[PDB]
Amino acid sequence: EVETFAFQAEIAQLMSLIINTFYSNKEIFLRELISNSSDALDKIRYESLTDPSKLDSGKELHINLIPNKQDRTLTIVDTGIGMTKADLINNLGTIAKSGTKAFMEALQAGADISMIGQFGVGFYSAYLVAEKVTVITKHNDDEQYAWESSAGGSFTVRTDTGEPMGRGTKVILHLKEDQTEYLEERRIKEIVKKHSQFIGYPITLFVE
Amino acid sequence: EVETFAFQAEIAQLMSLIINTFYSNKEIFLRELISNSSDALDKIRYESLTDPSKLDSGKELHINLIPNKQDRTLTIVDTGIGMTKADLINNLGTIAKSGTKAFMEALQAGADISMIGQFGVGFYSAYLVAEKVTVITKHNDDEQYAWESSAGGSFTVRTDTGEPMGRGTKVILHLKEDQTEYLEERRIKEIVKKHSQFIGYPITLFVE
Ligand SMILES: CN(C)c1ncnc2nc[nH]c12
Ligand SMILES: CN(C)c1ncnc2nc[nH]c12
Numbered sequence A, B: 001e002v003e004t005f006a007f008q009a010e011i012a013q014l015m016s017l018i019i020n021t022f023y024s025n026k027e028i029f030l031r032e033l034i035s036n037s038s039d040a041l042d043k044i045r046y047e048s049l050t051d052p053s054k055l056d057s058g059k060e061l062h063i064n065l066i067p068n069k070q071d072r073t074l075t076i077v078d079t080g081i082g083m084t085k086a087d088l089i090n091n092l093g094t095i096a097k098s099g100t101k102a103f104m105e106a107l108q109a110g111a112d113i114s115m116i117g118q119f120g121v122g123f124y125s126a127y128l129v130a131e132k133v134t135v136i137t138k139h140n141d142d143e144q145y146a147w148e149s150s151a152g153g154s155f156t157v158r159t160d161t162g163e164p165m166g167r168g169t170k171v172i173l174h175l176k177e178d179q180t181e182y183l184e185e186r187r188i189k190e191i192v193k194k195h196s197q198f199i200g201y202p203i204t205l206f207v208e
Helices: A009-020 A030-050 A085-089 A096-106 A113-119 A120-126 A175-183 A185-196 B010-019 B030-050 B053-055 B085-093 B100-108 B113-119 B122-128 B186-195
Strands: A003-006 A063-068 A075-079 A130-138 A143-148 A154-159 A168-175 A202-203 B003-006 B064-069 B073-078 B131-138 B144-149 B154-159 B168-174 B203-205
Touching: A003 B144, A009 A096, A009 A120, A009 A154, A030 A063, A030 A075, A030 A113, A030 A168, A030 A185, A063 A175, A063 A185, A085 A143, A085 A154, A096 A113, A113 A120, A120 A130, A120 A168, A130 A185, A143 A202, A143 B064, A154 B131, A175 A185, A185 A202, B010 B100, B010 B122, B030 B053, B030 B064, B030 B073, B030 B113, B030 B122, B030 B168, B030 B186, B053 B122, B064 B186, B085 B131, B085 B144, B122 B131, B122 B168, B186 B203
Parallel strands: A063 A202, B064 B203
Antiparallel strands: A003 A154, A063 A075, A075 A168, A130 A143, A130 A168, A143 A154, B003 B154, B064 B073, B073 B168, B131 B144, B131 B168, B144 B154
Protein backbone atom coordinates (compact mmCIF):
# COMPACT_ATOMS: atom_id res chain seq x y z
CA GLU A 1 0.00 0.00 0.00
CA VAL A 2 1.54 3.40 1.05
CA GLU A 3 5.31 4.08 1.49
CA THR A 4 6.42 7.31 3.18
CA PHE A 5 9.82 8.79 2.47
CA ALA A 6 11.68 11.89 3.78
CA PHE A 7 12.55 14.64 1.37
CA GLN A 8 16.23 15.17 1.09
CA ALA A 9 17.11 17.98 3.55
CA GLU A 10 17.80 20.53 0.81
CA ILE A 11 14.43 19.92 -0.94
CA ALA A 12 12.81 20.03 2.48
CA GLN A 13 14.54 23.45 2.91
CA LEU A 14 13.48 24.85 -0.41
CA MET A 15 10.01 23.55 0.06
CA SER A 16 10.05 25.43 3.40
CA LEU A 17 11.36 28.66 1.86
CA ILE A 18 8.49 28.65 -0.71
CA ILE A 19 5.80 27.88 1.84
CA ASN A 20 7.13 30.58 4.36
CA THR A 21 8.71 33.50 2.49
CA PHE A 22 6.29 36.37 1.87
CA TYR A 23 6.12 36.68 -1.94
CA SER A 24 2.99 38.11 -3.55
CA ASN A 25 3.77 37.05 -7.16
CA LYS A 26 2.37 33.54 -6.55
CA GLU A 27 0.97 33.13 -10.08
CA ILE A 28 4.31 32.05 -11.62
CA PHE A 29 3.54 28.52 -10.31
CA LEU A 30 1.36 27.79 -13.31
CA ARG A 31 4.08 28.75 -15.90
CA GLU A 32 6.42 26.44 -14.03
CA LEU A 33 3.98 23.54 -14.20
CA ILE A 34 3.00 24.26 -17.79
CA SER A 35 6.73 24.31 -18.43
CA ASN A 36 7.30 20.89 -16.89
CA SER A 37 4.49 19.49 -18.93
CA SER A 38 5.88 20.84 -22.27
CA ASP A 39 9.35 19.33 -21.37
CA ALA A 40 7.62 16.04 -20.61
CA LEU A 41 5.85 16.16 -23.93
CA ASP A 42 9.11 17.05 -25.67
CA LYS A 43 10.63 13.82 -24.24
CA ILE A 44 7.94 11.51 -25.49
CA ARG A 45 7.84 13.14 -28.90
CA TYR A 46 11.65 12.76 -28.90
CA GLU A 47 11.64 9.07 -28.06
CA SER A 48 8.74 8.28 -30.45
CA LEU A 49 10.79 9.72 -33.41
CA THR A 50 12.94 6.61 -33.37
CA ASP A 51 10.37 4.31 -31.77
CA PRO A 52 6.85 4.85 -33.19
CA SER A 53 5.37 2.30 -30.62
CA LYS A 54 5.97 4.60 -27.54
CA LEU A 55 2.76 6.26 -28.59
CA ASP A 56 0.60 3.11 -28.31
CA SER A 57 -0.19 4.46 -24.84
CA GLY A 58 -1.63 7.60 -26.61
CA LYS A 59 -0.69 9.60 -29.72
CA GLU A 60 -2.21 12.95 -28.50
CA LEU A 61 0.35 15.47 -27.05
CA HIS A 62 -1.28 18.24 -25.03
CA ILE A 63 -1.90 20.04 -21.73
CA ASN A 64 -5.27 20.24 -20.03
CA LEU A 65 -6.08 22.58 -17.15
CA ILE A 66 -8.89 21.36 -14.89
CA PRO A 67 -10.30 23.56 -12.15
CA ASN A 68 -12.69 22.08 -9.71
CA LYS A 69 -14.35 24.51 -7.34
CA GLN A 70 -16.18 21.93 -5.20
CA ASP A 71 -12.93 20.08 -4.54
CA ARG A 72 -10.96 23.30 -4.55
CA THR A 73 -8.31 21.70 -6.78
CA LEU A 74 -6.61 22.83 -9.99
CA THR A 75 -5.29 19.80 -11.97
CA ILE A 76 -2.58 20.32 -14.62
CA VAL A 77 -2.57 17.30 -16.96
CA ASP A 78 -0.20 16.29 -19.73
CA THR A 79 0.17 13.26 -21.90
CA GLY A 80 4.00 13.48 -21.70
CA ILE A 81 6.62 10.79 -20.96
CA GLY A 82 5.35 10.06 -17.43
CA MET A 83 7.50 9.00 -14.43
CA THR A 84 8.56 5.52 -13.26
CA LYS A 85 8.31 4.87 -9.54
CA ALA A 86 12.04 5.46 -9.38
CA ASP A 87 11.68 8.94 -11.11
CA LEU A 88 8.85 9.96 -8.75
CA ILE A 89 11.05 9.05 -5.75
CA ASN A 90 14.15 10.64 -7.37
CA ASN A 91 12.92 14.06 -6.29
CA LEU A 92 11.00 14.13 -9.35
CA GLY A 93 13.44 12.87 -11.99
CA THR A 94 14.51 16.49 -11.39
CA ILE A 95 18.13 17.40 -10.46
CA ALA A 96 16.83 18.84 -7.22
CA LYS A 97 19.77 18.60 -4.71
CA SER A 98 22.07 20.72 -6.89
CA GLY A 99 19.28 22.81 -8.44
CA THR A 100 18.15 23.77 -4.96
CA LYS A 101 21.62 24.63 -3.73
CA ALA A 102 22.55 26.79 -6.73
CA PHE A 103 19.05 28.32 -6.45
CA MET A 104 19.40 29.38 -2.79
CA GLU A 105 22.85 30.55 -3.67
CA ALA A 106 21.38 32.68 -6.51
CA LEU A 107 18.74 33.99 -4.07
CA GLN A 108 21.68 35.42 -2.01
CA ALA A 109 22.92 37.34 -5.04
CA GLY A 110 19.58 38.97 -6.11
CA ALA A 111 17.50 36.21 -7.68
CA ASP A 112 13.82 36.37 -6.68
CA ILE A 113 11.58 33.28 -6.34
CA SER A 114 10.14 33.47 -9.95
CA MET A 115 13.47 32.32 -11.32
CA ILE A 116 12.85 28.91 -9.67
CA GLY A 117 12.37 27.28 -13.08
CA GLN A 118 15.89 28.26 -14.08
CA PHE A 119 17.19 25.65 -11.61
CA GLY A 120 15.20 22.57 -12.61
CA VAL A 121 13.07 23.07 -9.52
CA GLY A 122 9.86 24.91 -10.80
CA PHE A 123 7.66 21.95 -9.80
CA TYR A 124 8.01 22.87 -6.05
CA SER A 125 6.48 26.33 -6.71
CA ALA A 126 3.13 24.46 -6.68
CA TYR A 127 3.49 25.06 -2.91
CA LEU A 128 3.06 28.83 -3.48
CA VAL A 129 -0.67 28.08 -3.80
CA ALA A 130 -1.22 24.48 -2.81
CA GLU A 131 -1.42 22.99 0.68
CA LYS A 132 -1.23 19.47 -0.71
CA VAL A 133 -0.13 18.21 -4.14
CA THR A 134 -1.05 14.78 -5.45
CA VAL A 135 0.87 13.62 -8.61
CA ILE A 136 -0.54 10.74 -10.67
CA THR A 137 1.81 9.39 -13.25
CA LYS A 138 2.04 6.61 -15.89
CA HIS A 139 5.26 5.85 -17.75
CA ASN A 140 5.27 3.24 -20.47
CA ASP A 141 7.87 1.10 -18.65
CA ASP A 142 5.87 0.84 -15.38
CA GLU A 143 2.57 0.80 -13.39
CA GLN A 144 0.52 3.78 -12.56
CA TYR A 145 1.65 5.57 -9.26
CA ALA A 146 0.30 8.33 -6.96
CA TRP A 147 2.91 10.39 -5.17
CA GLU A 148 1.76 12.92 -2.60
CA SER A 149 2.85 15.60 -0.10
CA SER A 150 1.54 18.33 2.23
CA ALA A 151 5.19 19.43 2.64
CA GLY A 152 6.11 18.78 6.24
CA GLY A 153 9.38 16.93 5.05
CA SER A 154 7.72 13.78 3.75
CA PHE A 155 6.08 12.21 0.81
CA THR A 156 4.07 9.05 0.10
CA VAL A 157 4.13 6.99 -3.05
CA ARG A 158 1.47 4.28 -3.62
CA THR A 159 0.39 2.43 -6.79
CA ASP A 160 -2.79 3.96 -8.09
CA THR A 161 -5.67 2.00 -9.63
CA GLY A 162 -9.11 3.64 -10.04
CA GLU A 163 -8.74 5.08 -13.53
CA PRO A 164 -5.92 4.01 -15.75
CA MET A 165 -4.73 7.27 -17.36
CA GLY A 166 -3.05 6.01 -20.51
CA ARG A 167 0.38 7.72 -20.31
CA GLY A 168 1.52 10.94 -18.66
CA THR A 169 1.16 12.92 -15.49
CA LYS A 170 -1.49 14.65 -13.43
CA VAL A 171 -0.39 17.15 -10.88
CA ILE A 172 -3.35 17.87 -8.60
CA LEU A 173 -3.24 21.07 -6.59
CA HIS A 174 -5.43 21.10 -3.44
CA LEU A 175 -5.50 24.90 -3.11
CA LYS A 176 -4.85 26.86 0.11
CA GLU A 177 -7.94 28.70 1.35
CA ASP A 178 -6.89 32.24 0.32
CA GLN A 179 -5.80 31.02 -3.13
CA THR A 180 -9.11 30.11 -4.79
CA GLU A 181 -8.48 32.83 -7.47
CA TYR A 182 -6.66 30.20 -9.48
CA LEU A 183 -9.95 28.31 -10.01
CA GLU A 184 -11.49 31.34 -11.79
CA GLU A 185 -11.54 30.95 -15.59
CA ARG A 186 -10.52 34.62 -16.28
CA ARG A 187 -7.78 34.39 -13.71
CA ILE A 188 -6.44 31.24 -15.37
CA LYS A 189 -6.66 32.47 -19.05
CA GLU A 190 -4.90 35.71 -17.86
CA ILE A 191 -1.98 33.69 -16.54
CA VAL A 192 -1.55 31.38 -19.56
CA LYS A 193 -1.73 34.44 -21.79
CA LYS A 194 0.75 36.40 -19.70
CA HIS A 195 3.44 33.58 -19.10
CA SER A 196 2.77 30.64 -21.35
CA GLN A 197 1.26 32.20 -24.44
CA PHE A 198 3.48 30.55 -27.06
CA ILE A 199 4.19 26.93 -26.14
CA GLY A 200 4.61 23.98 -28.56
CA TYR A 201 1.48 22.13 -27.41
CA PRO A 202 -2.27 22.66 -27.33
CA ILE A 203 -3.46 23.88 -23.88
CA THR A 204 -7.14 23.23 -23.00
CA LEU A 205 -8.79 24.94 -20.11
CA PHE A 206 -11.87 22.96 -18.91
CA VAL A 207 -14.97 24.81 -17.89
CA GLU A 208 -17.27 24.05 -14.94
CA GLU B 1 -20.33 74.52 0.10
CA VAL B 2 -19.68 71.64 -2.40
CA GLU B 3 -19.33 72.06 -6.20
CA THR B 4 -20.10 69.11 -8.44
CA PHE B 5 -18.61 68.37 -11.81
CA ALA B 6 -18.86 65.99 -14.69
CA PHE B 7 -15.70 64.23 -15.80
CA GLN B 8 -14.95 65.06 -19.37
CA ALA B 9 -16.54 62.10 -21.30
CA GLU B 10 -13.21 60.36 -22.17
CA ILE B 11 -11.95 60.39 -18.60
CA ALA B 12 -15.31 59.02 -17.48
CA GLN B 13 -14.82 56.16 -20.07
CA LEU B 14 -11.29 55.54 -18.98
CA MET B 15 -12.15 55.37 -15.26
CA SER B 16 -14.79 52.80 -16.31
CA LEU B 17 -12.14 50.68 -18.03
CA ILE B 18 -9.90 50.79 -14.95
CA ILE B 19 -12.82 49.78 -12.71
CA ASN B 20 -14.30 47.16 -15.06
CA THR B 21 -11.50 45.47 -16.99
CA PHE B 22 -10.45 42.20 -15.46
CA TYR B 23 -6.85 42.77 -14.51
CA SER B 24 -5.09 41.04 -11.60
CA ASN B 25 -1.93 43.15 -11.42
CA LYS B 26 -3.36 46.09 -9.45
CA GLU B 27 -0.28 46.68 -7.32
CA ILE B 28 1.01 49.12 -9.90
CA PHE B 29 -1.38 51.75 -8.67
CA LEU B 30 1.19 52.44 -5.94
CA ARG B 31 4.00 52.99 -8.42
CA GLU B 32 1.88 55.42 -10.43
CA LEU B 33 0.79 57.49 -7.40
CA ILE B 34 4.32 57.65 -6.06
CA SER B 35 5.71 58.70 -9.42
CA ASN B 36 2.94 61.41 -9.60
CA SER B 37 4.20 62.80 -6.14
CA SER B 38 7.76 62.79 -7.35
CA ASP B 39 6.77 64.91 -10.44
CA ALA B 40 5.01 67.27 -8.00
CA LEU B 41 8.19 67.50 -5.93
CA ASP B 42 10.52 67.97 -8.92
CA LYS B 43 8.31 70.96 -9.82
CA ILE B 44 8.47 72.81 -6.37
CA ARG B 45 12.25 71.91 -6.14
CA TYR B 46 12.59 73.48 -9.65
CA GLU B 47 10.49 76.49 -8.92
CA SER B 48 12.33 77.14 -5.72
CA LEU B 49 15.80 77.63 -7.29
CA THR B 50 14.54 80.91 -8.80
CA ASP B 51 12.22 81.74 -5.93
CA PRO B 52 13.11 80.30 -2.49
CA SER B 53 10.23 81.96 -0.57
CA LYS B 54 8.20 79.13 -2.22
CA LEU B 55 9.71 76.72 0.31
CA ASP B 56 8.34 79.02 2.98
CA SER B 57 5.45 76.56 3.31
CA GLY B 58 7.86 73.65 3.83
CA LYS B 59 11.40 72.72 2.85
CA GLU B 60 11.15 68.95 3.21
CA LEU B 61 10.46 67.35 -0.10
CA HIS B 62 9.23 63.86 0.79
CA ILE B 63 6.64 61.12 0.19
CA ASN B 64 4.61 59.45 3.04
CA LEU B 65 2.51 56.30 2.93
CA ILE B 66 -0.14 56.05 5.61
CA PRO B 67 -2.18 52.84 5.91
CA ASN B 68 -5.01 52.72 8.35
CA LYS B 69 -6.95 49.52 8.91
CA GLN B 70 -9.81 51.18 10.84
CA ASP B 71 -10.75 53.64 8.07
CA ARG B 72 -9.64 51.19 5.41
CA THR B 73 -7.49 53.77 3.69
CA LEU B 74 -4.05 54.08 2.21
CA THR B 75 -2.89 57.69 1.91
CA ILE B 76 0.04 58.91 -0.25
CA VAL B 77 1.20 62.37 0.90
CA ASP B 78 3.79 64.52 -0.87
CA THR B 79 5.06 68.00 -0.08
CA GLY B 80 5.16 68.85 -3.79
CA ILE B 81 3.89 71.84 -5.81
CA GLY B 82 0.27 71.17 -4.73
CA MET B 83 -2.69 72.04 -6.90
CA THR B 84 -4.79 75.20 -7.19
CA LYS B 85 -8.66 74.93 -7.53
CA ALA B 86 -8.18 75.16 -11.31
CA ASP B 87 -5.44 72.55 -11.49
CA LEU B 88 -7.74 70.16 -9.59
CA ILE B 89 -10.58 70.54 -12.14
CA ASN B 90 -8.45 70.52 -15.32
CA ASN B 91 -5.82 68.11 -14.21
CA LEU B 92 -8.06 65.66 -12.48
CA GLY B 93 -11.31 66.22 -14.39
CA THR B 94 -10.39 66.74 -18.05
CA ILE B 95 -8.06 65.24 -20.79
CA ALA B 96 -5.75 68.34 -20.26
CA LYS B 97 -2.18 67.35 -21.47
CA SER B 98 -2.75 63.57 -20.78
CA GLY B 99 -2.70 60.87 -23.43
CA THR B 100 -6.08 59.51 -22.34
CA LYS B 101 -7.14 59.07 -25.98
CA ALA B 102 -3.91 57.30 -26.99
CA PHE B 103 -4.07 55.20 -23.84
CA MET B 104 -7.64 53.97 -24.63
CA GLU B 105 -6.80 53.31 -28.26
CA ALA B 106 -3.62 51.50 -27.06
CA LEU B 107 -5.60 49.00 -24.91
CA GLN B 108 -7.75 48.32 -28.00
CA ALA B 109 -4.53 47.36 -29.94
CA GLY B 110 -2.92 44.98 -27.41
CA ALA B 111 -1.45 47.34 -24.66
CA ASP B 112 -2.22 46.66 -21.00
CA ILE B 113 -3.25 48.57 -17.89
CA SER B 114 0.35 48.44 -16.41
CA MET B 115 1.44 50.73 -19.24
CA ILE B 116 -0.94 53.49 -17.93
CA GLY B 117 1.94 55.83 -16.83
CA GLN B 118 3.34 56.01 -20.34
CA PHE B 119 0.20 58.20 -21.06
CA GLY B 120 0.16 60.58 -18.06
CA VAL B 121 -3.14 59.24 -16.60
CA GLY B 122 -1.73 56.88 -13.98
CA PHE B 123 -3.51 58.72 -11.16
CA TYR B 124 -6.73 56.87 -12.28
CA SER B 125 -5.01 53.58 -11.48
CA ALA B 126 -6.13 54.46 -8.01
CA TYR B 127 -9.54 52.99 -9.09
CA LEU B 128 -8.05 49.53 -9.45
CA VAL B 129 -8.05 49.23 -5.63
CA ALA B 130 -10.28 52.12 -4.32
CA GLU B 131 -14.02 52.67 -4.39
CA LYS B 132 -13.52 56.33 -3.46
CA VAL B 133 -10.63 58.76 -3.70
CA THR B 134 -10.17 62.06 -1.89
CA VAL B 135 -7.39 64.44 -2.80
CA ILE B 136 -6.54 67.11 -0.16
CA THR B 137 -4.20 69.60 -1.82
CA LYS B 138 -2.60 73.03 -1.10
CA HIS B 139 -0.63 75.25 -3.61
CA ASN B 140 1.29 78.34 -2.60
CA ASP B 141 -1.10 80.41 -4.77
CA ASP B 142 -4.56 79.07 -3.44
CA GLU B 143 -6.76 77.85 -0.53
CA GLN B 144 -6.63 74.23 0.61
CA TYR B 145 -9.18 72.01 -1.29
CA ALA B 146 -10.74 68.56 -1.09
CA TRP B 147 -11.59 66.86 -4.40
CA GLU B 148 -13.41 63.53 -4.26
CA SER B 149 -14.84 60.88 -6.55
CA SER B 150 -16.46 57.45 -6.41
CA ALA B 151 -16.39 57.61 -10.21
CA GLY B 152 -19.90 57.10 -11.70
CA GLY B 153 -19.02 60.05 -13.87
CA SER B 154 -18.53 62.93 -11.44
CA PHE B 155 -16.42 64.50 -8.77
CA THR B 156 -16.74 67.27 -6.14
CA VAL B 157 -14.49 70.12 -4.89
CA ARG B 158 -15.01 72.17 -1.66
CA THR B 159 -12.64 74.28 0.37
CA ASP B 160 -11.03 72.17 3.15
CA THR B 161 -10.52 73.95 6.51
CA GLY B 162 -10.40 71.26 9.16
CA GLU B 163 -6.71 70.94 8.74
CA PRO B 164 -4.13 73.13 6.91
CA MET B 165 -1.18 71.13 5.48
CA GLY B 166 1.39 73.70 4.50
CA ARG B 167 1.86 72.70 0.81
CA GLY B 168 1.40 69.52 -1.22
CA THR B 169 -1.20 66.73 -1.78
CA LYS B 170 -2.63 63.76 0.01
CA VAL B 171 -4.37 61.15 -2.02
CA ILE B 172 -6.55 59.00 0.27
CA LEU B 173 -7.80 55.73 -1.24
CA HIS B 174 -10.90 54.22 0.36
CA LEU B 175 -9.98 50.72 -0.53
CA LYS B 176 -12.42 48.18 -2.03
CA GLU B 177 -13.32 45.53 0.65
CA ASP B 178 -11.22 42.91 -1.02
CA GLN B 179 -8.29 45.16 -1.73
CA THR B 180 -7.06 45.43 1.85
CA GLU B 181 -3.64 43.73 1.24
CA TYR B 182 -2.40 47.15 0.40
CA LEU B 183 -2.83 48.06 4.12
CA GLU B 184 -0.23 45.43 5.12
CA GLU B 185 3.25 46.68 5.96
CA ARG B 186 4.83 43.66 4.27
CA ARG B 187 2.77 44.21 1.14
CA ILE B 188 3.55 47.90 0.97
CA LYS B 189 7.36 47.36 1.27
CA GLU B 190 7.26 44.67 -1.46
CA ILE B 191 5.62 47.11 -3.84
CA VAL B 192 7.86 50.10 -3.19
CA LYS B 193 11.02 48.05 -3.42
CA LYS B 194 9.71 46.40 -6.67
CA HIS B 195 8.54 49.61 -8.58
CA SER B 196 9.69 52.64 -6.69
CA GLN B 197 13.20 51.80 -5.44
CA PHE B 198 14.87 54.52 -7.50
CA ILE B 199 12.50 57.34 -6.56
CA GLY B 200 14.62 60.46 -5.60
CA TYR B 201 12.79 61.57 -2.43
CA PRO B 202 12.45 59.78 1.03
CA ILE B 203 9.47 57.46 0.99
CA THR B 204 8.23 56.90 4.54
CA LEU B 205 5.99 53.95 5.30
CA PHE B 206 4.14 55.08 8.49
CA VAL B 207 3.43 52.36 11.13
CA GLU B 208 -0.09 51.81 12.51
C1 LIG C 1 8.25 17.79 -12.98
N1 LIG C 1 8.45 16.46 -13.58
C2 LIG C 1 9.55 15.71 -13.01
C3 LIG C 1 7.69 15.87 -14.60
N2 LIG C 1 8.13 14.74 -15.27
C4 LIG C 1 7.42 14.12 -16.23
N3 LIG C 1 6.21 14.60 -16.60
C5 LIG C 1 5.72 15.73 -16.02
N4 LIG C 1 4.60 16.43 -16.20
C6 LIG C 1 4.59 17.45 -15.35
N5 LIG C 1 5.72 17.42 -14.61
C7 LIG C 1 6.44 16.38 -15.00
C1 LIG D 1 -2.53 64.04 -10.23
N1 LIG D 1 -1.85 65.34 -10.28
C2 LIG D 1 -2.10 66.09 -11.53
C3 LIG D 1 -1.03 65.86 -9.21
N2 LIG D 1 -0.72 67.20 -9.21
C4 LIG D 1 0.05 67.80 -8.23
N3 LIG D 1 0.54 67.16 -7.20
C5 LIG D 1 0.33 65.85 -7.13
N4 LIG D 1 0.72 64.96 -6.21
C6 LIG D 1 0.24 63.78 -6.50
N5 LIG D 1 -0.48 63.88 -7.63
C7 LIG D 1 -0.47 65.17 -8.07
